[PDB]
Design a protein around this ligand. Structure first.
Ligand code: CLA
Ligand code: CLA
Ligand code: CLA
Ligand code: CLA
Ligand code: CLA
Ligand code: CLA
Ligand SMILES: CCCCCCCCCCCCCCCCCC(=O)OC[C@H](CO[C@@H]1O[C@H](CO)[C@H](O)[C@H](O)[C@H]1O)OC(=O)CCCCCCCCCCCCCCCCC
Ligand SMILES: CCCCCCCCCCCCCCCCCC(=O)OC[C@H](CO[C@@H]1O[C@H](CO)[C@H](O)[C@H](O)[C@H]1O)OC(=O)CCCCCCCCCCCCCCCCC
Ligand SMILES: CC(=O)O[C@H]1CC(C)(C)C(=C=C/C(C)=C/C=C/C(C)=C\C=C\C=C(C)/C=C\C=C(\C)C(=O)C[C@@]23O[C@]2(C)C[C@@H](O)CC3(C)C)[C@](C)(O)C1
Ligand code: KC1
Ligand code: KC1
Lengths: 141, 172, 89, 164, 147
């Protein structure tokens, strides 16, 4: 049975091999994909953008410049276009500062586990931070 | 071969497991509907009413949340539904019941196609209470849930009708 | 699978619920759905012509809309009652 | 062949009385189990009805809605209690009994696993089946007589207006 | 749509032949999502955008979150008091595109034409599209998918 939903069977492609695998696929979206490589690429990228959008909304009131950010992200996504379709490791484009050469693959897995839990948290947070900005129009408080 | 609750009607024959069985079912809904669905519906009707009859009794016998939010000040249990949907309140309760019921629907749907899930089984047992119990003792506690649930279904329906018809709060 | 021969289909074409129901129970359900639909149509007719109960679609009641859909349920349950009777229930 | 399948071919003197002039038990031979379950149901209803008309004409239940001032003899107990509630209360519970108990009972009778008239009151029921068969014809004869008695009482109390 | 045609020819995204033969899941989605949800969404446009624009009110992307399309504002929908959305239609002397003579009803069954434009009432089209939406959403619950 699934870890996250114990009354559900474990999804077949959600064995404990990727980071963040809580067995959470109730709708069965992973049954039709051949691999979860492209979906992890999209989960990490949505989370890394949401992590920058959380801090970008903090430092916007606690002090088109963002047109240079979309032009900078677009250059990174253009040069690493084939990596989403090569079949390579999801999220890895070699943008590490040498820290990722480190302890063994159990520690590499817990680094990926720390990223994907920060990825999943900031997507909930930037959904919350932008909705209660559009409704109440307060910065904070 | 004969029903226990009605010893002139035959036994309905689809109730052979199912710990709360009296052989009762005269209209034989167990003959026509799946018993995994029927027990899941009886259990869910039971534990909803167990919370509901305790929540109606508590609200009628004083006991507001403190401090009381705006719009729920002079309000009994028979008028707390519409007052809470105007305050907010039940709108958030409906949102989180919906994501629980949509996820449990995949549990009910996979139970009726196999999967070996017991009706009325979620993972929810955080305080232990089943640490290696025998199946004669597990089935006994499941009987206590169905019996107390069957009582609170008839109780809440008595409380909600009498509080609105005779227009009183729960110590009538 | 669901192909059949002769004068009547087998019980299994009624689905997994009504294939096990008696023909007399499905027959009485059908009259109950027909009477609820006929009551819902007749009462929505008298709500249309009542001069204080038709404005802005106030003649539309949820229980009369839901009751009027007993019409196609009365058709199907009386067809299903015939199939169970031909199959010996 | 209803006289060999069922019991009750007697008269008021105890002689053998094969009474089916219209031959309904041969014209409607599948219905003769229903015919006995409904003869007993008509019989057991009319025996409580004849007692409940006589006992009403002397004793009421002690409420003011049921009192002698409200309902004069016994014949106004039906119409002057429709909107009051007690006629709606018995209409619910008898109709709930007939939907939940009696209707599964008459389909188990047609399937052949219960006897017609049996609703499980076997405490004072004797064994040695002929002794039980003698109790059933006593139920039938007192039942068939009460079906004319409640016809006589409720008709004569309207055209003549007298009590008892 | 040009990227998706390129993408669904790549070897990891080419759908299997069984996905193309799944008749029950395609009809369920195409009755619900393609037909019924789009008709519900088009009811969302003409209630929020088109019927205020015929009533002389500008509702665009700049102000549609803070401007309700009805004065009662979505509480008669959830309470089941749906006759509030048909209370006052536009008059027989409503100047189209202006607020003069203009009603506030968003779902009517008026019938016939707006007398100035000689065209259908937008509140009738909204109640048409909403009723078409519900019928098709229901119709997309017929066929046996995974559940
Ligand atoms: C309303 C929810 C509900 C549901 C889904 C069930 C379902 C069931 N009950 Mg329970 N029952 C209930 C309320 C319910 N019950 C209440 C409130 C009581 C107390 C009076 C009981 C007393 C009772 C006993 C004593 C027994 C059962 C049994 C059963 C099972 C038999 C199937 C059947 O014939 O009827 C199911 C169909 C309905 C309830 C539909 C009713 C709706 C119509 C239109 C009215 C089935 C799981 C038997 C069992 O559990 O097996 C061993 C058994 O021995 N029931
Ligand atoms: C000439 C009229 C006619 C007759 C006698 C039948 C007869 C039948 N239909 Mg068919 N059907 C018809 C026209 C007819 N159909 C039309 C015009 C449509 C719409 C295009 C259908 C759509 C349809 C479906 C989807 C199914 C049937 C099924 C059946 C069979 C089971 C009885 C039943 O409906 O369940 C009785 C119970 C009900 C109908 C309850 C449902 C209530 C709905 C809303 C009515 C029976 C052979 C079933 C079947 O063949 O299964 C293999 C089945 O699944 N019918
Ligand atoms: C045919 C059956 C029958 C019916 C329809 C009535 C109807 C009535 N009775 Mg009468 N009654 C009956 C039999 C019946 N009685 C019998 C057999 C007796 C002798 C015990 C009485 C003695 C009686 C008195 C003293 C009074 C009435 C009164 C009345 C009136 C209203 C209140 C009431 O229901 O009394 C309550 C019913 C009783 C006291 C009788 C109890 C029922 C007996 C024991 C048979 C029931 C057994 C059976 C297994 C129950 C199954 C129920 C089922 C739903 C599960 C009402 C018109 C009242 C009145 O004022 O009349 C105007 C009143 O004061 N009845
Ligand atoms: C809003 C009301 C609503 C309700 C009660 C349902 C209910 C259902 N849908 Mg439907 N769905 C809806 C709206 C709704 N849907 C709409 C507007 C569309 C676009 C038309 C769909 C598209 C759709 C498809 C394509 C399919 C279903 C299916 C089903 C059935 C799944 C059975 C089950 O237990 O699944 C297990 C549980 C789940 C899958 C979880 C989701 C269940 C919820 C109710 C659906 C989400 C509805 C809505 C978008 C969310 C808001 C509602 C509420 C929670 C706030 C169930 C009857 C399936 C079916 O078998 O139909 C015959 C199916 O294949 N639905
Ligand atoms: C809800 C989810 C959903 C949605 C929105 C769609 C949408 C679409 N899919 Mg589908 N698809 C889905 C799920 C979905 N799909 C699923 C789950 C499967 C697998 C089972 C498929 C498998 C699939 C395949 C294989 C194909 C599509 C295609 C399409 C496109 C259809 C062509 C078009 O654009 O016209 C949309 C038309 C409209 C919005 C207007 C409808 C106009 C008609 C004529 C209206 C008439 C009916 C009217 C209301 C009533 C009749 C009038 C009466 C009085 C006579 C459309 C984008 C095709 C495509 O083009 O892919 C690129 C295609 O080849 N799908
Ligand atoms: C059937 C659904 C549907 C359709 C075809 C339209 C169509 C339109 N909308 Mg409307 N709208 C809708 C539903 C719809 N809307 C809903 C559900 C809402 C929220 C209630 C709105 C709220 C809304 C506002 C506030 C505005 C529009 C506007 C428009 C116009 C230009 C939109 C645009 O430039 O996007 C570009 C098109 C795309 C990006 C294609 C989307 C592809 C999908 C997502 C797949 C266009 C006529 C604008 C306008 O100018 O009105 C005259 C405008 O200001 N709409
Ligand atoms: C109502 C629920 C019981 C209906 C039913 O089972 O029929 C039970 C009985 C007849 O019972 C019939 O038995 C047959 C075999 O004997 C078949 O099995 C039928 O399915 C069954 O309906 O119907 C009634 O008499 C109920 C009448 C209630 C409505 C009165 C108006
Ligand atoms: C609306 C009309 C409803 C029709 C009546 C249905 C109520 C059920 C009922 O009558 O009991 C249904 C009972 C069930 O009796 C039938 O016979 C046997 C019993 O011995 C078996 O149980 C059969 O399965 C059962 O169907 O049947 C009768 O009452 C037959 C009456 C027929 C008389 C109608 C002709 C009128 C002239
Ligand atoms: C033994 C026992 O126990 O009992 C016995 C008793 C008894 C009686 C003797 C027996 C019998 C014979 C029976 C039961 C015969 C019953 C026949 C029966 C009951 C029914 C046919 C309906 C036909 C049509 C065309 C209906 C609707 C058709 C339509 C198109 C609609 O309603 C349209 C509509 O819906 C919508 C689309 C939109 C709504 O807004 C408006 C309306 C409402 C207009 C049995 C079988 O022997 C059982
Ligand atoms: C985890 C995400 C989450 C957030 C972020 C959140 C936030 C707020 N909740 Mg909610 N809520 C749940 C989850 C969350 N709530 C859950 C799981 C339930 C049980 C189903 C639930 C039930 C209720 C009820 C009954 C009420 C309620 C309220 C508020 C209000 C308090 C403002 C304050 O504290 O000053 C703020 C916005 C009250 C209210 O005022 O609603 C207008 C109110 O009466 N909540
Ligand atoms: C077990 C659940 C149950 C409840 C909860 C309940 C409640 C009430 N019954 Mg009912 N009742 C039964 C069951 C139940 N009754 C049964 C099994 C029968 C035999 C078929 C039956 C028959 C009668 C008769 C003849 C009368 C009657 C009434 C009332 C009324 C006030 C009672 C009081 O306070 O003394 C309250 C609502 C009388 C009345 O006042 O009607 C206006 C009245 O005359 N009942």
């Amino acid at each position: 049975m699934s870890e996250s939903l114990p009354f559900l069977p474990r999804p077949e492609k959600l064995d404990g091999s990727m980071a963040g695998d809580r067995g959470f696929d109730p709708m069965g979206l992973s049954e039709i994909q051949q691999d979860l490589t492209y979906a992890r690429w999209a989960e990490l990228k949505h989370g890394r953008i949401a992590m920058l959008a959380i801090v970008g909304m903090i430092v916007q009131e606690y002090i088109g410049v963002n047109g240079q950010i979309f032009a900078a992200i677009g250059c990174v996504e253009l040069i690493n276009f084939n990596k989403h379709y090569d079949g390579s490791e999801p999220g890895d484009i070699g943008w590490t500062g040498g820290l990722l050469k480190n302890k063994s693959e159990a520690e590499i897995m817990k680094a990926k586990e720390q990223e994907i839990t920060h990825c999943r948290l900031a997507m909930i947070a930037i959904t919350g931070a932008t909705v209660q900005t559009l409704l109440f129009h307060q910065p904070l408080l | 071969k004969q029903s226990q609750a009605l010893p002139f009607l035959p036994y309905p024959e689809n109730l052979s497991g199912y710990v709360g069985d009296a052989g009762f079912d005269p209209l034989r809904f167990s003959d026509y509907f799946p018993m995994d669905y029927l027990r899941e519906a009886e259990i869910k009707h039971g534990r909803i009413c167990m919370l509901a009859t305790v929540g109606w009794i508590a609200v009628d016998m004083g006991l507001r949340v403190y401090p009381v939010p705006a719009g729920l000040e002079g309000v009994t249990a028979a008028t707390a539904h519409d007052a809470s949907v105007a305050q907010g309140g039940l709108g958030q309760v409906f949102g989180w019941v919906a994501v629980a019921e949509m996820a449990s629907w995949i549990g009910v749907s996979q139970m009726l196609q196999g999967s070996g899930r017991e009706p009325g089984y979620f993972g929810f047992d955080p305080l232990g209470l089943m640490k290696g119990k025998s199946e004669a003792e597990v089935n006994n506690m499941k009987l206590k849930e169905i019996k107390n649930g069957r009582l609170a279904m008839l109780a809440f329906s008595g409380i909600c009708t009498q509080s609105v018809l005779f227009d009183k709060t729960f110590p009538f | 699978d669901m192909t059949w021969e002769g004068e009547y289909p087998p019980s299994k074409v009624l689905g997994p619920i009504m294939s096990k129901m008696p023909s007399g129970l499905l027959g009485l359900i059908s009259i109950a759905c027909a009477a609820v639909c006929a009551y819902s149509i007749a009462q929505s007719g008298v709500l249309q012509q009542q001069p204080g109960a038709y404005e802005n679609g106030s003649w539309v009641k949820w229980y009369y809309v839901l009751g009027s859909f007993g019409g196609p349920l009365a058709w199907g349950t009386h067809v299903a009652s015939w199939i169970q009777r031909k199959n010996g229930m | 062949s209803v006289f060999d399948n069922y019991v009750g071919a007697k008269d008021f003197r105890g002689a053998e009385f094969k009474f089916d002039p219209l031959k309904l038990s041969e014209t409607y031979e599948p219905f003769q189990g229903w015919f006995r379950e409904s003869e007993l149901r008509h019989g057991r209803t009319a025996m409580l009805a004849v007692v409940g008309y006589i006992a009403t004409d002397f004793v009421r239940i002690p409420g003011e809605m049921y009192s002698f001032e409200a309902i004069p003899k016994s014949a106004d107990a039906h119409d002057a209690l429709i909107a009051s509630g007690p006629m709606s209360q018995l209409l619910l519970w008898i109709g709930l009994f007939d939907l939940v108990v009696t209707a599964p009972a008459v389909q188990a009778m047609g399937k052949g696993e219960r006897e017609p008239g049996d609703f499980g009151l076997k405490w004072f029921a004797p064994s040695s089946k002929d002794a039980f068969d003698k109790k059933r014809e006593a139920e039938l004869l007192n039942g068939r007589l009460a079906m004319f008695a409640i016809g006589g009482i409720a008709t004569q109390s309207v055209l003549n207006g007298h009590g008892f | 749509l040009l990227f998706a045609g390129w993408l669904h020819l790549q070897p990891k995204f080419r759908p299997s032949l069984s996905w193309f033969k799944n008749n029950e899941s395609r009809l369920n989605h195409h009755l619900s999502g393609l037909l019924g949800v789009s008709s519900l969404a088009w009811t969302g446009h003409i209630v929020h955008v088109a019927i205020p624009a015929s009533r002389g009110v500008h509702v665009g992307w700049d102000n549609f979150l803070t401007t309700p399309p009805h004065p009662a504002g979505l509480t008669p929908f959830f309470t089941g008091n749906w006759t509030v959305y048909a209370e006052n239609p536009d008059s027989a002397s409503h100047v189209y595109g202006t607020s003069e003579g203009a009603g506030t009803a968003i779902l009517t069954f008026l019938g016939g034409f707006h007398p100035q434009t000689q065209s259908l009432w937008l509140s009738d089209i909204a109640h048409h599209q909403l009723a078409i939406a519900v019928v098709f959403i229901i119709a997309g619950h017929m066929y046996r998918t995974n559940f």
